[PDB]
Amino acid sequence: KARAKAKTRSSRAGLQFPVGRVHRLLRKGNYSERVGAGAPVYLAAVLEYLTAEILELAGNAARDNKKTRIIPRHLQLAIRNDEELNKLLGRVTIAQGGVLPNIQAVLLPKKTESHHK
Template sequence: MEDSSAVVEKLAFGRKLGGEPKKKAVSRSVKAELQFLVGRIRRYLKEGQYAQRVGRGAPVFFASVLEYLAAEDEELGKLLAGVTIAHGGVLLNINLALLPNKAAAAAGSNKSPTKSAAKSPK
């Protein structure tokens, strides 16, 4: 018969109960310092069934090649000039003092639009 501590460890699935809190997950794009999303490229590689298996390094390498081509190839850079990559680039860090007050924004949204704004300019 097993003692109760062994049962508790099995129920914890590799983590001790009451231990340190679980760390926040870090994406593979952040680890590789890439703007292109590695997880999304992996999903497309698997869904496209280009091969039976997709290794761990394949989407990272593919994302880095795509990012390099988008940055360095002039024709491709012109083609992708207006494209916005979801969750890509630098995160906004705006000082809270520069943002408008929530109370002022809520009061401004309650006003009805004026007649001049409702007309279309023709």
């Protein structure tokens, strides 16, 4: 034998998310009888990209509120302000998320609130 030292499939893919855990989760879960090697890499990459997008929007909103730590509020702000993510999660509730600030124009008072004589 030689027993070449094992690197992780993640490290072969240049990714941070795992692979092996995903493969196990696909085997246990009644999705298909057999699973091909390529699938979990693709899936992991998809997850990484989405996660990166979300966090990036969250951190931008964070810098807008002068806080250095991400809290759920920021995630809600990121989600509803991107049309596509809002489409994906249109029927999802984020805990402690609240909603966007939005008042319909019509029920705000008229701008004629000033000198009137």
